[PDB]
Design a binder for this molecule. Structure first.
Ligand SMILES: C/C=C(\C)CC/C=C(\C)CCC=C(C)C
Ligand SMILES: [Mg+2]
Ligand SMILES: [Mg+2]
Ligand SMILES: [Mg+2]
Length: 305
């Protein structure tokens, strides 16, 4: 229990719609045939989304919850089945996803994950401009690239060094794609010059590292159980040749250090104008809601028990 070593100087919130949103995710999952088997009521994927996007209108929060569900269903295929150890099969599947992200219609014998991604594309297109769909699609593309990088590690029995793992981990988690949904949840449109400012990129990177490293500390047990080493704890242990307790200590020191980086750089956002800065503060608060949502959900979730 590492609760006491996962403290943030900011709190999160949860949408009042959390439980109805979760039930609507199980409907969507059944409807698209993503539920394998019998236990499904303990996935609670909607309760993650409810915390990550706590001021979203119910219809946007439902897209986010179905998107988070999609990522977990995809991720357990990558991390707990043979497709995550076969690059050729991953490439074949990612080519259908990327065709669907460009707006192509699923074919009759495209898999359930393909039909479901096309549903989420269609629904995001109803709520997002073309500029946003492009940014989101490109973040999702890099997630697929990170997933294929994991597959080659699995195929080779490789373990990357800390520097390589941390840099690839920023993409393997799809957190940048989940961050794009903050704009829709908060009904904001950041101008290109604010979106890409060095400090905003450093805050996004910081927040993504925190969410991934927090996840790594809480998920090393189940990842060890599937002989998987895409985890800061296991990668530190391999690099420093230290005890599991010492690797966990080092992982949590990196997590803590990253919280410090995020909190300090929050104070370094340039003043563009009242409007832009109000929209950026909503976005940066969004990153904080995600940081809290990841920890608060993961501590209570069957998935890490
Ligand atoms: C995936 C990024 C994390 C490791 C934890 C935060 C969870 C999500 C952003 C949605 C679920 C996505 C998975 C790839 C598990
Ligand atoms: Mg996983
Ligand atoms: Mg994974
Ligand atoms: Mg994990």
């Amino acid at each position: 229990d590492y609760r006491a070593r996962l403290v943030y100087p900011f709190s999160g919130a949860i949408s009042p719609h959390a439980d109805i949103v979760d039930q609507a995710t199980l409907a969507w999952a059944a409807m698209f045939g993503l539920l394998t088997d019998h236990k499904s009521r303990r996935l609670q994927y909607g309760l993650l989304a409810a915390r990550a996007y706590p001021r979203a209108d119910r219809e946007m929060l439902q897209i986010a919850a179905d998107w988070i569900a999609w990522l977990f269903f995809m991720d357990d295929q990558c991390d707990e089945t043979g497709i995550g150890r076969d690059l050729q099969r991953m490439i074949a599947l990612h080519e259908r996803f990327l065709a669907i992200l460009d707006g192509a219609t699923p074919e009759a014998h495209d898999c359930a994950l393909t039909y479901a991604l096309a549903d989420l594309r269609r629904r995001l297109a109803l709520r997002a401009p073309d500029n946003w769909l492009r940014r989101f699609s490109e973040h999702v593309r890099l997630y697929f690239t990170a997933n294929r990088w994991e597959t080659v590690n699995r195929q080779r029995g490789a373990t990357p060094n800390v520097a390589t793992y941390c840099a690839a981990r920023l993409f393997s988690g799809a957190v940048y794609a989940c961050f794009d949904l903050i704009e829709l949840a908060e009904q904001i449109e950041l101008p290109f010059y604010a979106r890409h400012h060095s400090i905003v990129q450093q805050l996004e990177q910081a927040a993504n590292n925190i969410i991934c490293w927090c996840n790594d500390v809480l998920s090393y047990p189940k990842e060890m159980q599937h002989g998987d080493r895409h985890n800061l704890v296991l990668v530190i242990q391999g690099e420093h040749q230290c005890s599991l307790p010492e690797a966990i200590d080092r992982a949590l020191d990196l997590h803590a250090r990253e919280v410090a980086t995020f909190v300090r750089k929050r104070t370094c956002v340039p003043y563009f104008d009242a409007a832009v800065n109000t929209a950026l503060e909503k976005y940066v608060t969004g990153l904080q809601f995600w940081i809290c949502a990841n920890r608060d959900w993961s501590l209570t979730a069957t998935r890490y028990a």
